[PDB]
Amino acid sequence: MVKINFPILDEPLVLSNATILTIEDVSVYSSLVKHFYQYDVDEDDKQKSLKATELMLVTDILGYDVNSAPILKLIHGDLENQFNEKPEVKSMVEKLAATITELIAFECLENELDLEYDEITILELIKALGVKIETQSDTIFEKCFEIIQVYHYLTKKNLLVFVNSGAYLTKDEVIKLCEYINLMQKSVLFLEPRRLYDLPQYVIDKDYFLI
Amino acid sequence: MVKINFPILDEPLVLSNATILTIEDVSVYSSLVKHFYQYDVDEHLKLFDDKQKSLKATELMLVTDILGYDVNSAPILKLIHGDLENQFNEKPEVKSMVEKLAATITELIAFECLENELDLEYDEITILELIKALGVKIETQSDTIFEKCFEIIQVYHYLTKKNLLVFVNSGAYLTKDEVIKLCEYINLMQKSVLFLEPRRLYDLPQYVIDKDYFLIGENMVL
Amino acid sequence: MVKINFPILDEPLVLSNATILTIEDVSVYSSLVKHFYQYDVDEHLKLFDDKQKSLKATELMLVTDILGYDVNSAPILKLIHGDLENQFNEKPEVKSMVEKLAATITELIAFECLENELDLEYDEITILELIKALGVKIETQSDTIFEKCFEIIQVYHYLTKKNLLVFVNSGAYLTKDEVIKLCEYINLMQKSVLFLEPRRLYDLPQYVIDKDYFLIGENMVL
Amino acid sequence: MVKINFPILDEPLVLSNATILTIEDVSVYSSLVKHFYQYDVDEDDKQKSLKATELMLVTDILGYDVNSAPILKLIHGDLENQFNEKPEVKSMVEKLAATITELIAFECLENELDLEYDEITILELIKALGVKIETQSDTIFEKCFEIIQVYHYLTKKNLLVFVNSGAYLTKDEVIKLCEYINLMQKSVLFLEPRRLYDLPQYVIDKDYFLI
Numbered sequence: 001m002v003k004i005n006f007p008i009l010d011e012p013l014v015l016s017n018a019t020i021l022t023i024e025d026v027s028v029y030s031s032l033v034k035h036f037y038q039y040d041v042d043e044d045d046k047q048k049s050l051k052a053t054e055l056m057l058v059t060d061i062l063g064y065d066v067n068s069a070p071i072l073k074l075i076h077g078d079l080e081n082q083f084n085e086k087p088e089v090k091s092m093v094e095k096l097a098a099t100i101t102e103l104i105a106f107e108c109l110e111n112e113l114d115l116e117y118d119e120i121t122i123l124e125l126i127k128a129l130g131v132k133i134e135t136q137s138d139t140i141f142e143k144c145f146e147i148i149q150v151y152h153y154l155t156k157k158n159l160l161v162f163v164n165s166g167a168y169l170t171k172d173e174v175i176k177l178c179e180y181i182n183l184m185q186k187s188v189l190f191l192e193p194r195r196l197y198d199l200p201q202y203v204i205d206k207d208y209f210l211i
Numbered sequence: 212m213v214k215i216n217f218p219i220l221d222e223p224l225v226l227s228n229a230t231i232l233t234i235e236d237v238s239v240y241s242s243l244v245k246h247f248y249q250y251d252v253d254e255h256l257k258l259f260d261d262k263q264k265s266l267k268a269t270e271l272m273l274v275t276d277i278l279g280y281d282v283n284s285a286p287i288l289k290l291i292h293g294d295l296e297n298q299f300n301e302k303p304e305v306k307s308m309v310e311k312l313a314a315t316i317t318e319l320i321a322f323e324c325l326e327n328e329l330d331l332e333y334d335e336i337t338i339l340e341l342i343k344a345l346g347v348k349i350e351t352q353s354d355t356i357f358e359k360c361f362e363i364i365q366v367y368h369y370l371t372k373k374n375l376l377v378f379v380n381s382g383a384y385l386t387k388d389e390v391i392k393l394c395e396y397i398n399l400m401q402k403s404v405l406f407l408e409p410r411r412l413y414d415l416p417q418y419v420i421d422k423d424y425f426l427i428g429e430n431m432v433l
Numbered sequence: 434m435v436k437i438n439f440p441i442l443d444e445p446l447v448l449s450n451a452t453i454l455t456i457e458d459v460s461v462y463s464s465l466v467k468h469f470y471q472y473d474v475d476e477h478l479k480l481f482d483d484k485q486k487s488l489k490a491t492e493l494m495l496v497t498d499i500l501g502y503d504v505n506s507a508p509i510l511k512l513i514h515g516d517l518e519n520q521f522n523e524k525p526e527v528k529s530m531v532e533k534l535a536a537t538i539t540e541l542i543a544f545e546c547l548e549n550e551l552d553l554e555y556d557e558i559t560i561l562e563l564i565k566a567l568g569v570k571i572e573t574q575s576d577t578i579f580e581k582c583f584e585i586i587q588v589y590h591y592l593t594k595k596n597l598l599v600f601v602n603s604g605a606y607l608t609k610d611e612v613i614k615l616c617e618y619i620n621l622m623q624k625s626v627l628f629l630e631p632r633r634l635y636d637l638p639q640y641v642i643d644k645d646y647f648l649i650g651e652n653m654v655l
Numbered sequence: 656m657v658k659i660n661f662p663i664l665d666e667p668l669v670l671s672n673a674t675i676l677t678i679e680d681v682s683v684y685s686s687l688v689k690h691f692y693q694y695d696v697d698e699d700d701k702q703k704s705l706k707a708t709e710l711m712l713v714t715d716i717l718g719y720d721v722n723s724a725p726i727l728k729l730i731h732g733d734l735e736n737q738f739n740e741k742p743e744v745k746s747m748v749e750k751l752a753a754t755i756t757e758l759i760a761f762e763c764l765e766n767e768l769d770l771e772y773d774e775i776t777i778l779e780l781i782k783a784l785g786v787k788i789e790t791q792s793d794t795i796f797e798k799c800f801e802i803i804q805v806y807h808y809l810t811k812k813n814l815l816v817f818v819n820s821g822a823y824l825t826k827d828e829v830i831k832l833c834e835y836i837n838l839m840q841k842s843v844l845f846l847e848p849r850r851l852y853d854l855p856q857y858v859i860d861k862d863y864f865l866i
């Protein structure tokens with residue numbers, strides 16, 4: 001359930017599900033952002049520190065790559081699972097693939113070479129279709145949603161941090177993100193330089209006090 | 212037919228179907244093998260006909276390591292998959308059938324994409340992608356060196372750009388009955404194959420350049 | 434100078450040297466940031482001048498993740514190393530000197546190659562290879578977000594193909610004195626830089642589009 | 656010091672330094688060649704079997720790649736060592752590199768960018784020179800020699816096997832190879848289908864007897 005601590009903070013802060021952390025001091029805010037990008041060099045999970053690779057750090061939302069080969073692999077596997085949950089439709093795809101197979105098989109036999117082959121699987125069909133996340137038309141909200149949905153897939157990630165993203169989002173959008181995150185039950189941090197609407201959030205004051 | 216010439220030969224030698232050329236002198240044998248591997252920078256080594264026209268270096272297929280020869284290399288697979296696509300292109304009715312089936316599959320996967328919580332897009336499933344997904348490749352059930360040779364000859368017949376296959380020093384791996392079977396198989400596929408040997412290959416019909424550099428026509432009809 | 438226009442503006446806005454543009458409405462701010470990232474497919478978003486001529490998409494340099502910005506990317510390094518080679522090409526005396534030294538080194542390594550028991554060959558040591566071997570790269574001693582910004586502006590000045598740099602939502606990382614220092618540094622390098630902000634950046638001279646979409650000239654001379 | 660055993664062989668045969676193994680039966684010869692290429696699937700060093708990666712197997716001599724990145728690395732390192740053994744000449748190279756460095760340094764300072772750099776090392780000079788084994792003009796003997804010389808570098812290889820190479824080599828050439836191998840003290844096997852001149856060699860007869 002991951003907790004955060006630094007010199008300014010007297011007691012470690014619990015980051016469960018969706019958390020907004022607002023730091024009103026510019027120099028402390030900029031410093032913490034810097035330290036996130038440098039994690040870990042300077043200074044629940046039973047006292048266990050998170051590996052650098054467990055961190056998912058986002059400032060440039062639109063530029064963030066949600067279509068990496070590891071992510072595509074998980075999406076295609078998830079889609080294969082959807083077919084597995086529908087035996088009716090899975091059989092349809094298989095029947096279609098078997099017809100295709102025999103058409104290619106006939107051409108293989110006509111070819112002068114002694115040719116062999118394996119099979120066309122549902123997963124191979126999904127991959128060949130080039131299924132990917134649409135990002136071209138993304139609003140910043142839409143891309144934030146896609147990033148969180150990807151974080152849901154990544155088991156080796158246990159903290160997603162949006163740096164200074166609040167400025168792009170309406171109150172209703174922040175709520176919608178948070179509600180999805182709460183349902184997901186993985187830790188997300190919105191690290192903000194000023195109050196994000198009137199939403200529940202941890203505020204470190206200009207006098208370094210926690211609210 | 213392909214013709215071979217080099218200084219030691221008095222005249223060019225015709226290489227039609229399966230030919231065995233035996234060189235009994237180690238130095239001359241070794242030099243000829245070297246010149247084949249250098250073709251055509253050497254010459255000395257001449258390969259022609261194409262009526263009087265030299266074979267391009269690209270037309271030569273040299274095999275010394277029989278088991279190491281990769282019948283399903285990336286370039287060979289690319290050729291096979293492209294040729295199979297062309298076979299569909301030449302058959303409009305069946306091409307249309309494959310395309311129809313791929314589109315029905317696409318519509319089914321598209322539905323699952325919309326059901327999925329992510330905003331998903333995709334391209335298309337092509338005939339080439341289907342051929343590739345099926346894992347089409349040349350059958351390779353050969354265990355022995357003898358068996359492997361047939362697969363190599365099959366590749367040679369497939370490659371229209373090749374006009375001479377040379378097995379270098381392969382006789383040592385093969386029984387007499389095996390060489391006969393290979394030569395019979397070679398005869399069926401029409402293209403020139405040379406077995407280049409350092410010693411006489413049993414008592415089979417063969418050209419022999421002996422220790423005094425005479426060309427002898429061994430078990431050959433007078 | 435570069436000019437920016439979009440429907441909410443009554444007339445184009447001149448972006449000369451350092452400019453702060455503040456948009457107090459979340460939706461309009463978010464939409465403008467999106468349109469910058471989509472430039473030029475959107476438009477709506479207009480960027481021109483080049484006297485009346487639209488900036489090409491390639492002329493825009495957008496920075497939101499300051500610390501993530503890679504100042505020594507492979508493309509940037511390739512440009513730097515090529516430019517340094519060109520600097521030698523423009524100086525025949527020094528080019529000749531480098532070539533002479535490389536040839537003396539070559540003759541020394543060549544001797545060791547002949548002493549070595551392997552039959553060794555080689556090509557040549559080029560000026561470009563020497564530049565690359567030396568590990569020439571932009572100095573990056575920045576620790577803070579503020580310090581990193583100077584390195585980004587330096588890259589922007591270097592890239593002649595870029596004609597607008599936009600820092601998106603960067604004001605939140607910087608003190609007032611820091612923004613002033615950045616703007617003073619930007620002024621020295623002549624090219625247009627836009628700080629695109631969702632809230633007023635201290636009391637610095639800035640253009641503000643307020644909640645009712647009025648354009649206000651904040652701490653600006655009347 | 657590696658030993659060889661198979662069904663036909665009643666006792667394991669010691670393969671020390673250069674060894675010629677002649678098998679007069681065509682079917683046994685072809686079979687053993689096949690098994691070498693399949694090692695290990697079918698059936699000194701204290702009873703320890705060699706890994707497949709310890710094997711260096713050569714039939715197509717001229718086609719064999721002696722200029723792989725791992726080999727080039729070792730050659731360039733060996734050449735750097737030759738300079739290290741000659742402090743006089745090493746200093747000459749360094750002095751020349753330092754002059755080059757300052758010429759580039761001046762251009763770096765003239766350039767509008769604030770540029771830094773490291774150093775030009777002897778090893779980097781050798782690599783930039785593109786030092787490699789010449790193979791284009793190779794006779795088969797010359798390439799055999801190069802292959803053995805490369806085997807000398809490869810510490811993770813402990814048996815080099817030339818399959819049916821004798822046919823290409825004169826007696827004096829086989830001697831020259833063997834003498835280098837004996838000096839090297841790594842195991843090399845010449846696997847031959849008939850006697851290789853009158854040189855000392857292990858012969859398995861047409862009646863399967865060892866001489």
Ligand SMILES: [Ca+2]
Nearest residue numbers: 108109111113
């Ligand atoms: Ca067939």
Ligand SMILES: [Ca+2]
Nearest residue numbers: 119120344345
């Ligand atoms: Ca398959």
Ligand SMILES: [Ca+2]
Nearest residue numbers: 128129130335
């Ligand atoms: Ca596709």
Ligand SMILES: [Ca+2]
Nearest residue numbers: 134135138330
């Ligand atoms: Ca989208």
Ligand SMILES: [Ca+2]
Nearest residue numbers: 324325327329
């Ligand atoms: Ca969907």
Ligand SMILES: [Ca+2]
Nearest residue numbers: 546547549551
């Ligand atoms: Ca040498």
Ligand SMILES: [Ca+2]
Nearest residue numbers: 763764766768
């Ligand atoms: Ca400089």
Ligand SMILES: [Ca+2]
Nearest residue numbers: 566567774775
């Ligand atoms: Ca260096």
Ligand SMILES: [Ca+2]
Nearest residue numbers: 557783784785
């Ligand atoms: Ca070079």
Ligand SMILES: [Ca+2]
Nearest residue numbers: 552789790793
């Ligand atoms: Ca050589």
